[PDB]
Amino acid sequence: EEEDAGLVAEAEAVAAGWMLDFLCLSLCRAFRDGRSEDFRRTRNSAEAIIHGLSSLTACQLRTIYICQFLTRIAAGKTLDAQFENDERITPLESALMIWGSIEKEHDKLHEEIQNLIKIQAIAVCMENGNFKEAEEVFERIFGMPFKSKLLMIISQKDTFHSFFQHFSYNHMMEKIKSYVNYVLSEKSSTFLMKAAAKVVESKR
């Protein structure tokens, strides 16, 4: 009876890990496709499964960070969303913190996404008329060429500027979608998705 309960809890932890990988794959795909409502519902499922997990493997921590990163990027223009205990931290700043924490290769794409999030973290505040908040995000992030141009843009209180058209929110999303395609390819062989695909293919 005691061994039975033990084996059952271990089996629930295995299944929870398989559910986490499948939900991360589904979340990545909804993000890449721009399926906003599927992303919302999948995100809710992923959060609930993660709340039911205890200690994590390095792989599971990376998967959770990817889910959290996409959630913040999706909420990047929702300045009312509070992702950190410190209520001042904006969604793009929270995404930047996770991006710098993930155990992943720092290739050129990594740095380009990093710099696009830094620029857009300021741009989203400016576009909302939140000029003082844009200066506070700048101080928190920056923590010379990009830096000084950004401070000049903030000080000129322009709700829109040329620099933000070149390092745009759409540019940031496309670069992130390139990384999401890699995560999708990497996770498409995980157990639950492989098993479900084999079932669907067998019915053709």
Ligand X SMILES: COc1cc(CN)cc(OC)c1OC
Which residues bind to ligand X, rule: CB under 6 A?
50-51, 53, 56, 64
How many residues bind its own copies, per CB under 8 A? Answer: 33
Q: How far apart are CA 49 and CA 23, in angstroms?
A: 9
CA distances from 150 to 58, 88, 143, 166, 174 (A): 36, 20, 13, 13, 22
Q: How far apart are CA 184 and CA 179, in angstroms?
A: 9
1 touches its own copies by CB under 8 A: no
Supply 141's token pair: 């992030």
79 touches Ca ion by CB under 5 A: yes
84 touches its own copies by CB under 8 A: no
Q: Which amino acid is at 76?
A: G
Place of tokens 């496309």: 174
Q: Which stretch binds its own copies (CB under 8 A): 6-14, 81-89, 147-155, 172-180?
A: 6-14
Answer for which of 12, 84, 86, 186 binds its own copies (CB under 8 A) is 12
Query: Rounded to the nearest whole angstrom, what is the least distance from the CB of residue 175 to Ca ion in the complex?
Result: 25
Closest CB to Ca ion among residues 79, 184 = 79
Q: How far apart are CA 113 and CA 171, in angstroms?
A: 9
Angle between helix 2-33 and 58-74 (nearest 10): 40
Q: Of residues 39-68, which lie at the interface with its own copies (CB under 8 A)?
A: 41-42, 44-45, 47-49, 51-52
Contact 101, 114 (CB under 8 A): no
Closest CB to ligand X among residues 101, 148 = 101
List interacting residues with its own copies (CB under 8 A): 5, 7-8, 10-12, 14-15, 18-19, 22, 26, 29, 33, 38, 41-42, 44-45, 47-49, 51-52, 191-193, 195-197, 199-201
Residue ranges that bind Ca ion, judged by CB under 5 A: 79
